[PDB]
Ligand binder design. Structure first.
Ligand SMILES: *[C@@H]1O[C@H](CO)[C@@H](O)[C@H](O)[C@H]1NC(C)=O
Ligand SMILES: *[C@@H]1O[C@H](CO)[C@@H](O)[C@H](O)[C@H]1NC(C)=O
Ligand SMILES: *[C@@H]1O[C@H](CO)[C@@H](O)[C@H](O)[C@H]1NC(C)=O
Ligand SMILES: *[C@@H]1O[C@H](CO)[C@@H](O)[C@H](O)[C@H]1NC(C)=O
Ligand SMILES: *[C@@H]1O[C@H](CO)[C@@H](O)[C@H](O)[C@H]1NC(C)=O
Ligand SMILES: *[C@@H]1O[C@H](CO)[C@@H](O)[C@H](O)[C@H]1NC(C)=O
Ligand SMILES: *[C@@H]1O[C@H](CO)[C@@H](O)[C@H](O)[C@H]1NC(C)=O
Ligand SMILES: *[C@@H]1O[C@H](CO)[C@@H](O)[C@H](O)[C@H]1NC(C)=O
Ligand SMILES: *[C@@H]1O[C@H](CO)[C@@H](O)[C@H](O)[C@H]1NC(C)=O
Ligand SMILES: *[C@@H]1O[C@H](CO)[C@@H](O)[C@H](O)[C@H]1NC(C)=O
Ligand SMILES: *[C@@H]1O[C@H](CO)[C@@H](O)[C@H](O)[C@H]1NC(C)=O
Ligand SMILES: *[C@@H]1O[C@H](CO)[C@@H](O)[C@H](O)[C@H]1NC(C)=O
Lengths: 463, 463, 463, 463
């Protein structure tokens, strides 16, 4: 039994390091700064030398147009060298051509107050697939003014902060030179290409670095609520598209196929309560999905080979970025559980074996009270979301209300804006919540543990 | 008994979802940004392009006048389209006409130092209803220089940060165009309309959005302590005045009448200790008040129909805003308690039934020590309020002293300004407080729980 | 026994409200903003319209001179009305005349490196009473260039942040008009009145408000370490000098004499372990000192009556401010203990009487471990002070090291600057400290309480 | 036995104060501000009057060159007096001559994407000793363009934030006057002395203060990742080079030799489990290393005596600074343990002796669970490092991930940037982590303590 379990033990250990390497391998070290530089270059720089706003700060269409004609252009272009080529920071190819796309809503004049009408007029509804405007507004002289379909226009539905956005819309592809684009942009600014009905706009472009070998994929997303104003958001995604350069890169490819063998091995072992069984299943599952994604999704690299042919087009990577995110998401979670599986082997010692059974007994009593806990915890949340959330950012959405309360329990708080929001309930909410939750209810957990812990020490001491 | 209780159970459940819908229904999603845009447009923008102060920052009359003639005007007006009409952000009707009002105090020269007199001269006392100045100061050519009464001038006493303010005062109604107002404002600036005796000023206007259907009601409040300086405060209230547009809006109206039936049902059941009884009463009570407000207060909508007739006047909404706040306040609290009522049904399981009786026994011992606790907790508060509170904002008022101490217990602290305030007691206060309260006294709670918890597990285990 | 104790009970209660009133009475409500306005007017305003530094920010002599000739002058003067008079904010008399004073150190060339000499030359030592320079440097045409004595120059030793400073030094009294002062200041700037040997400078002036009746006393303190640079500090003290205006003010005077009777009563009762006895002594003690200060110190008001005669001089209030601080310090502490004395009466109930004896038994075991605790707690402190404190502000002095660790236990942290200071020990210190202290050692307290609590519940339950 | 232990007790006490003095003695008080002034003078000042960036803010080569030609020069030079001499703040000799050095990497065109080539061209790899470029780029007219060796160029490998850097490289020595340097700098800017291949640059200079007797050694370090951009870092090290000036300084020298006797005494006593034995060893060890460093490393002072001869050269102190850091590091840690040794003497009292054996028994059960704890704690860390760390600064490196989680447990959090990084896992990570770790797992510690504490009180009470 011992050696039999010890047989599986090393199998697990061998399985550990293989994965630990792929993580270490598939992750370059300094990637962070590469993003950080890109981000600061775009997000953090003043729109114009005269203006103090950043892209993070954009409050208006006027703000936006400034940003376009402003730092963005300066951000994208450098001199240097072709001269049709520009290296960002001097280290980074601007890869192919940038693309701007927007979404427009059909005229919503249907909405009827009674009675106002000619004192309005019309309106435009909140973005929806139904409300999406396909009419060819404006001079109709190009893709900018002509609707295209998410099928015809290669692209995927993007999930924004207030809404999901289809790939379809009105778009334009920029130029290789800072000037030609400016001409294009100004033309789009001269003609009004951002109107009442423009809910959201996209700016997508990709960047390659040759020093380290990586691609940065950028989506600048700007939303226009029916309430007016601007909600900027951004995404910077590094990608390793060419997986084979260095011998180490090939060494990982071996390990990847090596790693593939292990899972297939565990697949068989999985075939016939228990917790570790329940655990083992998960790791196997995620592992598969991780691989499936890795193979017939990310390994495609078809867009690259296409773009490599014609480098004057827009290299749509939006999917490739999308998936490796999903990949890293899953890949990480696997590793997390993989470590947790190590506990199954720790019971060798008395103390551990003692502790092992304790937390097991801890579970049932906890799981009951946890229910009792969150019911209250959610009650405040739903309360706060009603009182606040038309005022305070932190409470804006019901999700972040829940989050906010955790930060409160930990002590991260903005109290002032709460008190500003409602001078009465704000204090009451904060006081009562901090009282019952943090003084009493939290302690009720720890109370349960002591009992179940001491009891297990008690009766096992009897043996 | 079981099915009998189960009969009431579903009644509660049905009552839950009805309410959950009205909450979800009566609350639109994205309202937050609508406020946030309005706020940033006014509060957050520089007074003048040359000046770095915001409305939040106003330190002086000069600051104030700048703000009026400054961003405020630019905030209110847009072009566009009548041209007598302006859309804020382009999405928002400026609704009717803005109104400025101030409060003035009778000359307080009565206050006598001995002896100074001609070296002063006179003075003006802190605002009070008694001290309120009704004299027609200045050129006396209009409402600006002529006192009106809160009865004659439709309006309610507003509760400010240093004082409550009657609706009465000296006011002026602005114009539809940015220019005419500027002429008015400048005239009020040319003539001195803000003098030594001006304690507080109001700026009230309303804004409609047609994309979503909502009204934003704005009160810009500026106080002038007898100590000089400025204390700005602001309120942005969304309102749904027209409740009937979409079928969904009508569907809620049905549910509202449907929901009315349930309470009337519970009214009868309430008619004949116990805790749940004590609870059930509360929910019934609040529910009624919520409805009464909803009907003969908020449902009035008389001002709208009046304003709809004449759109060149000032649409006084101050009350309508006031009540829906009270409404949302009560409405929220109800929901909170409604969820809590769900516990009454959770005792089905042993574990829950176990936990249920535990916290019940927890109560008496806690309630005793809680008294013992706050006596100390308040002692520090009253101490801090004496030591600090002439220095530190956080301690300014005795209320916020209490609040501040909670943030300390949680770890939210500004220590520096404490140490700056008093280099001796500041540390001592902070150290001792953090010591006895957080190390010892908090733990004394949790100590009590363990005993009462383990004891209940102990003796019930005997059964 | 019961009624006998009940006799003392009401005596205490009557004693409570009397004190509660004097606190409420002797403290006006809105004083905070009065300070806050003054502070922001001076501390918070840019030195010059072109410059972004505040008084809080001063880094250099050049910074300082700018501030003097800069915002300070603008801060002090207003127009308006005599015109020799100016109202700050328009609400505040500039009271009398401002005064600037500095401290200078004898030339410290004695300090000998071996060997440098003519490559230096000389030096100036850190401020001390010994090192204080009495030589009449400069043109010697006035008090600015002539040393005076703290006896001759009415004044008290002030306690600064890096050093205590005698009242003596080189000073100048300003003028009633913004211009004349500027001439004076410029002359002091033309001639070099701030030299290598100038360790610290003072700016003292007082301000009266007639709306509410109060005096604000201001000390602007600027230190010049031997290391160069500037360390600004400031003090704003409100004073109520004329205690008799309103009938309420006279009503307090009655209560004050009334309150005097109570203490004299308790004096006798104090005359013959125990804790409450030990407590009762303290309250009596502090009460006396509070009164003694109140009478033959603060009630003097001699400087006022002198200044009232000649309003063109400098009204030295530095002492009067100094004492009422001491007064408020003591006065507050008394109130704090007074509330605590209320516990002596709470044992009526079983639960309280139960809890009462528990914490009493809690004491001995705690007091032992507390020693064990701080020994470690101080160890880290002394460690951090050695590692940090040449780098991080928070650790600058050993005192604030102790303070800083409390904020860490609570979660208030600046970690970045720690890691920046020492990339190795910084993490180790922070990690280990947070580990042993917060995980283990804190819990060791709470462990003790449970035992001593449950035991007391246990054995008393046996009865 | 008692007096025998009491014999060692005073030996320890005498050993305490000797060390406490050396700490107090070898540490001057106000050194902090001396650094703080230097830091703010360089780090905190705008690059140019027109520019808002600080040295901390440098984002680009252009930023850097500005800083050089900018505030740095102004920071170093002052007038005053030779005039070839300049006093920083007027209090500080610029000591000798500043020196700039950079590191360059061989052209990395070897890196092959397939296929791009002439669309790149070339590249430059991440810094390494191998990749280090020794070629004499540029006009080759001086040390700036000529490679030197860390042997030939006196210097030590420096440990930067992304990499360790050899002392070797391309350097230049500046001039005594602000102008001549500017000519040099401009020449280095005219010619391109910062190219694609420049990974990191150094700016080293030293400063003496004669008021207090100290040296400040400065290393300004600027890194250029292969990703472009700039990563500034800085070091300010005070040094006491001349240990003999004041009699007090000589008094310490006596104590130092006195202190040397004690350790040699303990050396013998150390010669023959136990914990205190294990402890005593450590203190002895560190003490030795501290002394050895103090003698044949720091006491060398050879560079000074050399520099004192020729004051126009670069006074390389980099080592001297390096070691006294190591010295202070060790010196501090010793003191820390020295205090801890005091516990060995505290068992005189019952309570202490009681507590002593408790925590001893606490150990074994804790040490087991601590393992169980960190396994999970690290799991999240490794998870967060995969999910985040390409986005969030706080998670950038695996080390700081661990650190970040502690700050979370304490409540120091930036949640926003987490949610921005990954809108899905970010919340999940934060929520689950805060849940299991802070609610459950932490309490599991405290659970263990209660058992082991109460049990020890229980059975010892039986005696
Ligand atoms: C606005 O709506 C009206 C009626 O639905 C329509 O005639 C008009 O074309 C719409 N405006 C635009 C720009 O589509
Ligand atoms: C569309 O028409 C406008 C107006 O004449 C013109 O400026 C623009 O260049 C046209 N677009 C194209 C693609 O020809
Ligand atoms: C989609 O990809 C195909 C692949 O060749 C290309 O021909 C087409 O132009 C693309 N459509 C877009 C980018 O809208
Ligand atoms: C100030 O008070 C005096 C006396 O009470 C009065 O004559 C004068 O009118 C007052 N000033 C104003 C502006 O009312
Ligand atoms: C009141 O008198 C002033 C001064 O003549 C004048 O400017 C103002 O227009 C008058 N107001 C009205 C409403 O006539
Ligand atoms: C109050 O409302 C009535 C309603 O018609 C209106 O006539 C009157 O002018 C209002 N008074 C004000 C706004 O002061
Ligand atoms: C500096 O010291 C020297 C010698 O102690 C002395 O002659 C000289 O007067 C001092 N300087 C000043 C300004 O006092
Ligand atoms: C002292 O002498 C200087 C230089 O002549 C002169 O400017 C200044 O006014 C004199 N001071 C007095 C008080 O006369
Ligand atoms: C101190 O006070 C006395 C009181 O009359 C005064 O004469 C003297 O000038 C004062 N000394 C100062 C302010 O230096
Ligand atoms: C770049 O690399 C090529 C080939 O390795 C080489 O010929 C060239 O000299 C390199 N550039 C520099 C500046 O060294
Ligand atoms: C190296 O050559 C350049 C170009 O002629 C010249 O400017 C520079 O002064 C030279 N350097 C030296 C040290 O002569
Ligand atoms: C290293 O130090 C020696 C000591 O004299 C000196 O001669 C030599 O120039 C130095 N080398 C440097 C600073 O590169």
């Amino acid at each position: 039994y011992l050696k039999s379990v010890l047989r599986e033990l090393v199998t697990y250990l061998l399985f550990l390091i293989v994965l630990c390497i792929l993580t270490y391998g598939m992750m370059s070290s300094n990637v962070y700064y590469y993003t950080r530089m890109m981000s600061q270059l775009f997000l953090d720089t003043p729109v114009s030398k005269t203006e103090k706003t950043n892209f993070k700060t954009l409050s208006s269409m006027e703000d936006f147009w400034k940003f376009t004609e402003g730092s963005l252009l300066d951000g994208l272009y450098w001199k240097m060298e072709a001269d049709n080529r520009s290296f960002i920071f001097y280290e980074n190819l601007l890869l192919g051509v940038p693309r701007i796309r927007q979404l427009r809503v059909r005229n919503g004049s249907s909405s009827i107050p009674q009675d106002l009408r000619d004192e309005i007029k019309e309106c435009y509804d909140v973005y929806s697939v139904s409300s999406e405007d396909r009419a060819p507004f404006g001079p109709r002289n190009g893709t900018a003014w002509i609707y295209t379909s998410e099928k015809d226009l290669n692209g995927s539905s993007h999930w924004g902060i207030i809404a999901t956005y289809s790939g379809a819309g009105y778009y334009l592809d920029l130029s290789r030179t800072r000037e030609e684009t400016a001409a294009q942009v100004a033309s789009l600014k001269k003609n009004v290409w951002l109107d009442r009905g423009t809910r959201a706009t996209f700016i997508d472009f990709s960047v390659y670095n040759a020093n380290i070998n990586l691609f940065c994929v950028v989506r600048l997303l700007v939303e226009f609520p029916a309430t007016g104003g601007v909600i900027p958001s951004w995404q910077f995604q590094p990608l390793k598209l060419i997986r084979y350069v260095t011998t180490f890169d090939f060494f990982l490819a071996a390990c990847e196929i090596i790693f593939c063998f292990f899972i297939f091995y565990y697949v068989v072992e999985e075939i016939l309560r228990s917790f570790w069984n329940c655990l083992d299943v998960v790791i196997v599952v995620l592992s598969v999905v991780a691989i499936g994604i890795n193979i017939y999704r990310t390994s495609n690299v078809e867009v690259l080979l296409q773009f490599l042919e014609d480098q004057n087009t827009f290299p749509n990577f939006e999917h490739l970025a999308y998936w490796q995110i999903q990949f890293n998401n899953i890949a990480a979670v696997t590793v997390f559980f993989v470590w947790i599986k190590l506990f199954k082997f720790i019971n060798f010692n008395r103390t551990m074996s003692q502790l092992s059974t304790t937390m097991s007994r801890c579970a049932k009593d906890l799981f009951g009270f946890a229910i009792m806990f969150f019911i209250i915890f959610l009650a405040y949340a739903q309360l706060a979301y009603l009182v606040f959330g038309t005022q305070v950012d932190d409470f804006s959405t019901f999700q972040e209300c829940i989050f906010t309360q955790f930060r409160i329990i930990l002590g991260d708080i903005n109290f002032a804006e709460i008190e500003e929001a409602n001078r009465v309930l704000g204090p009451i909410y904060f006081t009562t919540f901090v009282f019952f939750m943090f003084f009493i209810l939290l302690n009720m957990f720890l109370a349960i543990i002591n009992d179940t812990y001491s009891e297990v020490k008690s009766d096992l001491a009897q043996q």
